[PDB]
Amino acid sequence: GAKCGACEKTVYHAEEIQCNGRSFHKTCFHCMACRKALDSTTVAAHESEIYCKVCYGRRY
Ligand SMILES: [Zn+2]
Ligand SMILES: [Zn+2]
Protein backbone atom coordinates (compact mmCIF):
# COMPACT_ATOMS: atom_id res chain seq x y z
CA GLY A 1 0.00 0.00 0.00
CA ALA A 2 1.19 3.47 0.92
CA LYS A 3 2.56 5.17 4.02
CA CYS A 4 0.95 7.77 6.21
CA GLY A 5 1.71 11.40 5.54
CA ALA A 6 1.85 11.62 9.33
CA CYS A 7 2.93 8.17 10.50
CA GLU A 8 6.00 6.22 9.51
CA LYS A 9 3.46 3.43 9.40
CA THR A 10 1.64 2.05 6.38
CA VAL A 11 -1.70 3.31 5.09
CA TYR A 12 -4.13 0.88 3.52
CA HIS A 13 -7.46 1.18 1.78
CA ALA A 14 -8.80 0.44 5.29
CA GLU A 15 -8.43 4.08 6.29
CA GLU A 16 -6.87 5.80 3.29
CA ILE A 17 -7.75 9.42 2.70
CA GLN A 18 -5.95 10.73 -0.36
CA CYS A 19 -5.31 14.42 0.16
CA ASN A 20 -3.44 16.30 -2.59
CA GLY A 21 -1.27 13.32 -3.47
CA ARG A 22 -0.53 11.58 -0.20
CA SER A 23 -2.35 8.81 1.64
CA PHE A 24 -3.31 9.75 5.19
CA HIS A 25 -4.96 7.62 7.85
CA LYS A 26 -8.53 8.62 8.65
CA THR A 27 -7.16 8.83 12.18
CA CYS A 28 -4.39 11.15 10.96
CA PHE A 29 -6.33 13.28 8.47
CA HIS A 30 -6.98 15.96 11.06
CA CYS A 31 -4.95 19.11 11.64
CA MET A 32 -1.21 18.56 11.81
CA ALA A 33 -0.72 21.91 13.56
CA CYS A 34 -3.20 21.75 16.44
CA ARG A 35 -5.30 18.59 16.27
CA LYS A 36 -8.74 19.74 15.07
CA ALA A 37 -10.72 17.18 13.08
CA LEU A 38 -10.96 18.35 9.46
CA ASP A 39 -13.73 17.72 6.95
CA SER A 40 -13.53 17.53 3.13
CA THR A 41 -14.30 21.22 2.62
CA THR A 42 -12.87 22.60 5.86
CA VAL A 43 -9.30 21.30 5.51
CA ALA A 44 -6.87 23.84 4.10
CA ALA A 45 -4.11 22.22 2.09
CA HIS A 46 -1.24 24.14 0.51
CA GLU A 47 1.59 22.52 -1.46
CA SER A 48 2.23 19.59 0.88
CA GLU A 49 0.75 20.87 4.14
CA ILE A 50 -2.76 20.32 5.50
CA TYR A 51 -4.23 22.13 8.51
CA CYS A 52 -7.44 23.55 9.92
CA LYS A 53 -8.48 27.08 8.93
CA VAL A 54 -7.30 28.24 12.36
CA CYS A 55 -3.67 27.18 12.00
CA TYR A 56 -3.82 28.11 8.33
CA GLY A 57 -4.96 31.55 9.45
CA ARG A 58 -2.18 31.45 12.02
CA ARG A 59 0.74 30.62 9.73
CA TYR A 60 -0.64 32.44 6.70
ZN1 LIG B 1 -1.28 7.60 10.34
ZN1 LIG C 1 -5.22 23.49 13.47
16: CA distance to ligand 2 center in Å? 20
Helix, strand, coil % in the chain, rounded to nearest 5: 15, 30, 55
Is 39 in contact with 17 (CB distance < 8 Å)? no
Q: Where are the beta strands (DSSP E) in the chain?
A: 2-3, 10-11, 16-19, 22-25, 44-46, 49-51
Question: In the chain, what are the domains?
Answer: 1-60 (2.10.110.10)
Give the ligand with the smallest distance to the CA of 4.
1
31: CA distance to ligand 2 center in Å? 5
